[PDB]
Amino acid sequence: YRYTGKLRPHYPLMPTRPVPSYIQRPDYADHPLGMSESEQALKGTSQIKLLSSEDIEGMRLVCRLAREVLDVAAGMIKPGVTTEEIDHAVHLACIARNCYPSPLNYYNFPKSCCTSVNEVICHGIPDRRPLQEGDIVNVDITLYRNGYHGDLNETFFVGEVDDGARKLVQTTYECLMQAIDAVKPGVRYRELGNIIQKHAQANGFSVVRSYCGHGIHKLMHTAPNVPHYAKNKAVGVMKSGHVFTIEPMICEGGWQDETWPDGWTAVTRDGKRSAQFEHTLLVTDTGCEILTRRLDSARPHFMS
Numbered sequence: 355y356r357y358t359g360k361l362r363p364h365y366p367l368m369p370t371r372p373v374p375s376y377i378q379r380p381d382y383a384d385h386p387l388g389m390s391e392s393e394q395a396l397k398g399t400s401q402i403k404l405l406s407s408e409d410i411e412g413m414r415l416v417c418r419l420a421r422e423v424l425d426v427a428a429g430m431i432k433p434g435v436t437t438e439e440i441d442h443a444v445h446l447a448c449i450a451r452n453c454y455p456s457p458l459n460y461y462n463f464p465k466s467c468c469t470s471v472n473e474v475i476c477h478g479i480p481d482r483r484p485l486q487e488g489d490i491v492n493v494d495i496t497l498y499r500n501g502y503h504g505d506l507n508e509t510f511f512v513g514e515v516d517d518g519a520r521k522l523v524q525t526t527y528e529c530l531m532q533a534i535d536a537v538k539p540g541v542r543y544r545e546l547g548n549i550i551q552k553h554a555q556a557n558g559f560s561v562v563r564s565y566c567g568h569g570i571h572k573l574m575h576t577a578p579n580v581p582h583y584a585k586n587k588a589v590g591v592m593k594s595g596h597v598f599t600i601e602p603m604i605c606e607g608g609w610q611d612e613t614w615p616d617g618w619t620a621v622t623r624d625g626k627r628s629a630q631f632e633h634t635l636l637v638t639d640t641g642c643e644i645l646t647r648r649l650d651s652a653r654p655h656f657m658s
C-alpha cells in the first residue's frame with residue numbers, strides 16, 4: 355500500500371477492551387463479524403422514522419451522555435498523548451455512564467471511538483502514535499444506551515497549529531452551523547449540501563463525497579442519507595420527529611478519499627488535511643433540537 359501522507363498506523367494495538375456484561379449491548383456486539391441483524395433487516399429502506407415520545411427521551415439521554423464522553427476526550431488532547439490512550443479513557447467513560455461504546459466490534463471495528471488525525475477524513479483507529487504539536491485530530495463518539503445510539507464529533511488542535519489548520523477547522527465548524535441553522539420541517543435533505551459546499555468552496559476547501567450524515571436512533575445508521583456536497587440527489591424532506599446527523603468533512607486539497615488496508619481509515623488521496631464536526635439533530639416544529647450540544651459552553655473546544 356502507498357500511504358497518501360506522513361501518517362502511518364502504529365501497531366500492535368492493545369487487546370480488545372472488555373465491556374462488563376451488565377452494560378446492555380447492541381445486537382452486533384456479539385456477532386462474529388460484527389454484523390447487526392436489526393440493520394440487515396432494515397437495510398435499503400427509504401422510510402424515515404417519526405420518533406415517539408419515548409424515543410425522543412431515549413435519544414435526548416444517550417446524546418447527552420455522548421457529549422459528556424466527547425468532553426472527557428477533549429480534556430486529554432495535548433502533544434505526547436496517544437490516540438489509544440484517548441480511546442482507553444473514552445471506553446472507561448462510556449462504561450461509567452452505563453453505555454456501550456457503539457463503534458466497538460461494529461463490523462469488527464477494533465476500538466471504542468474514532469480518532470482522525472490530519473489527512474484522516476474519518477474512521478481512524480486509535481493506536482500507539484502520540485499526537486504531535488501542530489496536528490489536528492477529530493474524535494468521534496458514538497454511545498449506545500437502552501436501545502438508542504447517539505453520535506457527535508469535534509476536531510481539536512494539538513498545541514499550536516498553522517494558519518491553514520485554523521482556517522480549515524473554523525470553516526468546517528461554520529459549515530456545520532450554517533447547515534444546522536437551515537434545519538426545520540419542509541426543507542429537503544438534499545439542500546444541506548448546497549449550503550455546506552457554498553461556504554467550503556468560498557474558503558478554498560473541498561467537500562468529501564463518499565461519507566454522509568445519516569439517520570440514527572435504534573440503528574447507528576439508517577435513513578435519511580445526508581450528503582454534504584452541492585447538487586446531490588438525497589431523497590426526502592424534513593418533518594418534526596426526524597433524527598439525523600450532519601457531519602461535514604472538509605479538505606485542504608481535493609475531495610477524493612481512499613481506505614487504508616485496515617479497511618476503516620479513510621484518508622485524503624492527496625495527503626492534505628481534513629476536518630469534521632458532527633451533531634445529532636431532532637427536527638421540531640420551530641426548527642431542531644441539537645441533542646449533542648455542549649451544555650456548559652456556547653462554543654466548541656477548538657475555540658477556547
Ligand SMILES: [Co+2]
Binds near residue numbers: 599632
Ligand atoms: Co455520524
Ligand SMILES: [Co+2]
Binds near residue numbers: 495507601
Ligand atoms: Co459520528
Ligand SMILES: [Co+2]
Binds near residue numbers: 575
Ligand atoms: Co453499516
Ligand SMILES: [K+]
Binds near residue numbers: 472627
Ligand atoms: K482529520
